[PDB]
Amino acid sequence: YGPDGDPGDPGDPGPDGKPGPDGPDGPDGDPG
Amino acid sequence: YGPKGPKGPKGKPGPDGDPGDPGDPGPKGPKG
Amino acid sequence: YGKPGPEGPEGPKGKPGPKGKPGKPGKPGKA
């Protein structure tokens, strides 16, 4: 009949995010 | 006085992380 | 004994995902 128990632990850290977007296209090639 | 109650349940998992950083630039197009 | 403690706080946000892959090759030069 005493005081409330201690708060539970913090939840797990969320899942890792998705992979980042593809990088920008490379620069145009040199003229022949 | 009475003993405190049982420790509470662990919290819920965190939200998903942000998407990753964008990729590096691609290679330069082939020579002409 | 007392009541059960409250639910623990929600976990923190996850870490950023893997860095993206390298981009596509450029626009082939004129011949």
Can you put this structure into words, describing what you see?
The PDB classes it as structural protein. With 32 residues, chain A is largely without helices or strands. Helix content of chain A is 0%, strand content 0%. Helices cover 0% and strands 0% of the residues of chain B. Chain B has no helices and no strands. Helices cover 0% and strands 0% of the residues of chain C.
> Approximately how much beta-strand content do the residues of chain B carry?
under 5%
DSSP summary: helix tally of chain C: 0
Note the quaternary state here: heterotrimer
Largest interface: A-B, 32 and 32 residues
- Could you give a short account of the major beta sheet of chain B? none
Helix content of chain B: under 10%
Q: What structural category arises from helix and sheet content of chain C?
A: little secondary structure
**Apparent shape of chain B:** rod-shaped
- Rg of chain C is 26 Å
- What's the N-to-C terminus distance of chain C? 85 Å
Overall strand count of chain B: 0
Helix tally of chain B equals 0
Number-wise, the strands of chain C total: 0
Structural class of chain B: little secondary structure
PDB class: structural protein
Keywords: collagen, heterotrimer, triple helix, structural protein
Assembly: trimeric
Entry title: Crystal structure of collagen heterotrimer with KD, ER and KE axial pairs
Structure summarized in a few sentences:
The complex is a heterotrimer of chains A (32), B (32) and C (31). Chain B has 32 residues and is low in regular secondary structure.
Short descriptors:
heterotrimer; B: 32 residues; little secondary structure; rod-shaped; C: 31 residues; structural protein; collagen; triple helix
Summarize the SSE layout with pairings.
The complex is a heterotrimer of chains A (32), B (32) and C (31).
Chain A: no helix or strand
Chain B: no helix or strand
Chain C: no helix or strand
